[PDB]
């Protein structure tokens, strides 16, 4: 009976930890998202065409 019961508590515990981690991750993302996105799009737009460094003539 103890085994039948306590595993519910353990499940609640582990899901609680998972929810906390997901919240922390989502918060950090929602904070740094703008500065990552602007950089990423700027890097996409900055083309800088170059010939292969081995080209001859």
């Amino acid at each position: 009976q103890a085994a039948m019961g306590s595993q519910g508590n353990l499940s609640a515990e582990v899901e609680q930890a998972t929810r906390r981690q997901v919240q922390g991750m989502q918060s950090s993302q929602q904070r740094n998202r703008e500065r990552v996105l602007t950089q990423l799009l700027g890097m996409v737009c900055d083309v800088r065409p170059q010939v292969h460094p081995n080209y001859r003539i």
């Binding site: 900055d46 083309v47 800088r48 170059q50 292969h52």
Partner: protein, 459 residues
């Protein structure tokens, strides 16, 4: 970062076995990765096995079946193969080429490392020193592993070398007289054994520490070639950058050497000894010697190659070269296995050339070396007496020889024999050793110094 866009060629000029030959390639790289689309929409990776002028020979990971000229496209990825590494892959299960097969996400890289790595600078490598305990008494007590040693578990086909490897994976850890990590890497492991590994590590709580790479027996042999290198690249990241002691368990290096043979024959090199390539020594060295402690970084990499010795011939190129490069040997033995002893580790031919660094006060305990030597001596004398018994008869034996026979029995039955899920600290293995050595009165333990006998023997 590579900004330039990738070139995709439909110029396949031949398909010869596992190789697709493309021509008019612009400045091919050797070892460049390729993603080639078959006519029917399927996709297969490949590695530029060779280069010449405007030609590139792409070893397609999966077979070349269904490839053709005139419709197969072949994107050149413009860089060598690189593994994404993080701590996140500690606690994951991957197939031979870094694809997750635990239904998790693709790894969010902390870095991209070239899987060939570089050789550790011999003037930066350090001596291994302290012990890594595997829980298996037969190697913790008698063949202990120093942090940075490379010690292979020789075993014949059919012996439980896979089960021993799994036990080491589930039990290993620092002697704790929490920065330990494991990198399991199964090469050429059949599906049932791979499932055994995956489910065992998942079930027995160890998955937090273990990054498990699986190259099933029917996965591409090129993925087999690159699996040990992925394993060791992750091990180098976790050890020399995350500073946590890693234990790399490469499984079935014979099944790795077979893939090496296949790739050589694909290159159309002539065979070396016993059919294996001539350079197998350098290659196996490149795999093994990515190990050991390094000055100025508190991590390390220990290795435990596991070898299926063909025909049980210790002269065969795989075990011979592995003995040349590694620092010991642990024999899984067929007579013990048949007698149904587990772990059938035969401690007479087994050896650990750096055990002398992993033991002693402050690392395992004051009496480790002495108990190991005495157990070995009494075990060998007991085997001698057991050979003699059947010739001279039991009643022709002296009382000392009966003591040795009893010690042989109880050493094979209480110390060597462990059961898969029994984890014994090195301290417990030593106390079992003492419980066996007390079969003898002190005067027979001639290899133990009196300063130790007087301290440990009583009780």
């Amino acid at each position: 970062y590579l900004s330039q866009p990738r070139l995709t060629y439909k110029t396949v000029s031949g398909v010869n076995g596992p190789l697709v030959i493309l021509d008019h390639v612009k400045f091919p790289r050797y070892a460049e990765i390729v993603h080639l689309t078959l006519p029917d929409g399927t996709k297969r990776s490949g590695q530029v096995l060779e280069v010449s002028g405007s030609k590139a020979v792409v070893q397609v990971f999966e077979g070349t079946s269904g490839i053709d000229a005139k419709k197969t496209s072949c994107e050149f990825t413009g860089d060598i193969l690189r593994t994404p590494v993080s701590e996140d892959m500690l606690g994951r299960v991957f197939n031979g080429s870094g694809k997750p097969i635990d239904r998790g996400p693709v790894v969010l890289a902390e870095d991209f490392l070239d899987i060939m790595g570089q050789p550790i600078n011999p003037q930066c490598r350090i001596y291994p020193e302290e012990m890594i305990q595997t829980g298996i008494s037969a190697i913790d007590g008698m063949n202990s592993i120093a942090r940075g040693q490379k010690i292979p578990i020789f075993s014949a086909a059919g012996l439980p070398h896979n089960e021993i490897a799994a036990q080491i994976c589930r039990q290993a850890g620092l002697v704790k007289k929490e920065n330990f990590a494991i990198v399991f890497a199964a090469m050429g492991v059949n599906m049932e054994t791979a499932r055994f590994f995956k489910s065992d590590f998942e079930e027995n709580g160890s998955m937090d520490n273990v990054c498990l790479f699986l190259n099933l027996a029917n996965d591409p042999t090129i993925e087999r070639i690159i699996t040990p290198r992925l394993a060791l690249t992750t091990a180098e990241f976790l050890a020399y950058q995350c500073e946590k002691h890693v234990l790399v368990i490469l499984t079935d290096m014979s099944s790795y050497a077979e893939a090496l043979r296949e790739v050589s024959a694909a290159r159309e090199e002539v065979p070396g000894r016993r059919g294996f390539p001539g350079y197998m020594y350098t290659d196996l060295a490149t795999i093994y010697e990515r190990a050991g402690r390094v000055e100025g970084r508190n991590g390390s990499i220990t290795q435990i190659p596991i070898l299926t010795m063909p025909n049980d011939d210790i002269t065969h190129p795989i075990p011979d070269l592995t003995g040349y490069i590694t620092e010991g040997q642990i024999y899984v033995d067929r007579q013990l296995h048949n007698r149904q002893i587990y772990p059938p580790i035969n401690v007479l031919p087994s050896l650990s050339r750096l055990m002398k660094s992993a033991i002693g006060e402050g690392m395992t305990r004051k009496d480790h070396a002495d108990v190991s030597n005495q157990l070995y001596a009494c075990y060998a004398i007991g085997k001698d007496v057991q050979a003699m018994k059947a010739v001279v008869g039991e009643e022709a034996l002296t009382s000392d020889d009966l003591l040795y026979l009893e010690f042989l029995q109880k050493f094979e039955k209480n110390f060597i024999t462990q059961g898969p899920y029994e984890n014994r600290t090195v301290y417990e293995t030593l106390d079992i050793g003492w419980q066996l050595l007390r079969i003898f009165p002190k005067e027979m333990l001639k290899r133990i110094p009196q300063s130790t006998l007087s301290e440990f023997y009583p009780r």
